Design a binder for this molecule. Structure first.
Ligand code: ZTW
Ligand code: ZTW
Lengths: 9, 243, 242, 9
C-alpha cells in the first residue's frame, strides 16, 4: 500500500 | 487503446536528457556488528526506495502504465535498481562498495554479516566488469531504466487485452532505449560491429544483476527471519512482494 | 598466454552450422506430487548427460580449463534446460512440452507444491518467444550465450589465467552476437530492427536467469522434503548452488 | 565428480 500511495502522490 | 505515448516520440538525445534529469538525489548514510551493518544498508535502502518511486515516475513511458502495473514493475525491479547504482558508484573503488560517499565498505567487512561476503563478491565482480568496459553514465542510466521496464514485464498477473496493450507499450519504450544506447555508441565513434557487441555486453550484465538481486532477496528474507532488519515499512513492503 | 582459439576465426554461417550440429539428442520421457516430480527430474538427469556433450561442441568451450568448464555448466544447466523447454513449448500455448510424449497442462503444475508459479513464468517466456517469431538459428545462439555468460562473473579467482579465460569467453560471446546480427540482416531486418531484436532476445535471458534461480530454490526444497529420490548427476549439480 | 569424468570423456 505505501508504494501505491507514493505512486499516486 | 490509448493514443501512442509521447515517450515514443523522443529522439535519442531527448531520452538521455530525460534520464539524466530524473536521477534521484545523492544520499549519505546515517565498528560494525551483524545487526549494526545490516542496519546501515537497510536504512540506506528504505530511504533510497522513497526516491526511486519518484525517479520511476520520470522515466519516459512509466506513468502511461496502469498504477497496478507500475507497482508490479517497481516490486520486481527495486533490488536490481539499488544494486546497479551501487556497482556504478563503486566502479572507481576497486575491492570496495560505495554504499554512499560516507560509507565505503571493504570486501572483508561483508564477512561481518552471515552470507553477505558472497553477495559482496558478485557486486564487486560486476563492478570490475563495468570498469573494464569503461561504462558511461549515459549508458548506465539507460541500463537502469531498461531494468525498471523489463524485469516485471513477463509476470504481469493478467492475460487481458489491456495487459497486452501495456506490455506492447513497455516493449516500445524498451526499443527506444535500445535505439538511445546505439546512438550514444555511434556518437562515441564505435564501428557498427563495435556498437552491436557493446549492446549485448551491457544487456548480458543484466542477467548477472537479476541473479545478484534474487540472492539478495533471499538473503534479505533470511535476515528478516532472524530479526536483524529494522522495521522499515517501505522496504518491508517491497520485500513481501517477492515472498 | 594461449594463441587465439580457432573458434574466433569462424564466420557467422560457420558458427551457426557448428551450433546446429552440436544439438543434443531429442529424448522421450519414461500424477502425484512425487510422481510428477519423478518424471521431470528423471528427464532432467538424462538431459544433463547429453548437455555435457553438447557443451563440448560449442565453439570455444573446450579451450577453457576443465575447472572453468565445470563452473560454467554448474551455473547454467537449469537455464539451459529451461530455454530448450520454452523453445519446444512455443507451438503449444498453455502447455509445457517437457518431451514429445510428455505435454503438461498449466493446471497439472498445481499437482506439485510451488510449481504453478514456475510453470507460469515458463509459459510466459514461451508466449514471448512466439510473439517474436524466434527462429532456431536464433535459439542456438541464445542457448550458447547462456552457457558462456552465466558463470563468467563468478569464477572467484583473480589470476592472470582467469583474466585470460574470461577474455576468451567474451570474445566467443562477441562472435555469437555477430552471428545473431548476421542472421537478422540475412532475414532482411533493418539496421534499427536488428539492434532492437538483439536487445529483445538478450533481455529474455534475465527472465530465464530468474526462472532458473526460483527453480533451483524449488528443486532444493523438493530434495529437502524427500518428494523425489534424486539421481547422482542431477543431485551433483544442485549442490553447486547450495 | 560425475561432471569431471563426463567432461574428460
Ligand atoms: O544502494 C544500495 C543500498 C542498499 C543495498 C543492499 C544490499 C543488500 C544485500 C543483502 C541484504 O540482505 C540487504 C541489502 S541492502 C544495496 C544498494
Ligand atoms: O527439459 C527440462 C526438464 C526439466 C525441467 C525442470 C523444471 C523444474 C522446476 C522445478 C523443479 O524442482 C525441477 C525442475 S526440472 C526443465 C527442462
Amino acid at each position: 500500500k505505501i508504494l501505491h500511495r507514493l505512486l499516486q502522490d | 487503446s490509448k493514443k501512442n505515448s509521447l515517450a515514443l516520440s523522443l529522439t535519442a538525445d531527448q531520452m538521455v536528457s530525460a534520464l539524466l534529469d530524473a536521477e534521484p538525489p545523492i544520499l549519505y548514510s546515517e565498528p560494525f556488528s551483524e545487526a549494526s551493518m545490516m542496519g546501515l544498508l537497510t536504512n540506506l535502502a528504505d530511504r533510497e526506495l522513497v526516491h526511486m518511486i519518484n525517479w520511476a515516475k520520470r522515466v519516459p513511458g512509466f506513468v502511461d502504465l496502469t498504477l497496478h502495473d507500475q507497482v508490479h514493475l517497481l516490486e520486481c525491479a527495486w533490488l536490481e535498481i539499488l544494486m546497479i547504482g551501487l556497482v556504478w558508484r563503486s566502479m572507481e573503488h576497486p575491492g570496495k562498495l560505495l554504499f554512499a560517499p560516507n560509507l565505503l565498505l571493504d570486501r572483508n567487512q561483508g564477512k561481518c554479516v552471515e552470507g553477505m561476503v558472497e553477495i559482496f563478491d558478485m557486486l564487486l565482480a560486476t563492478s570490475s566488469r563495468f570498469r573494464m568496459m569503461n561504462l558511461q553514465g549515459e549508458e548506465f542510466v539507460c541500463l537502469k531504466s531498461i531494468i525498471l521496464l523489463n524485469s516485471g514485464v513477463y509476470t504481469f498477473l493478467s492475460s487481458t487485452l489491456k495487459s497486452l496493450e501495456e506490455k506492447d507499450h513497455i516493449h516500445r519504450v524498451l526499443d527506444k532505449i535500445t535505439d538511445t544506447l546505439i546512438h550514444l555508441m555511434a556518437k562515441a565513434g564505435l564501428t557498427l560491429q563495435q556498437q552491436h557487441q557493446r549492446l549485448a555486453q551491457l544487456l548480458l550484465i543484466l542477467s548477472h544483476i537479476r541473479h545478484m538481486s534474487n540472492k539478495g532477496m533471499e538473503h534479505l528474507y533470511s535476515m528478516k527471519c532472524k530479526n536483524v532488519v529494522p522495521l522499515y515499512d517501505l522496504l518491508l513492503e517491497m520485500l513481501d512482494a517477492h515472498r
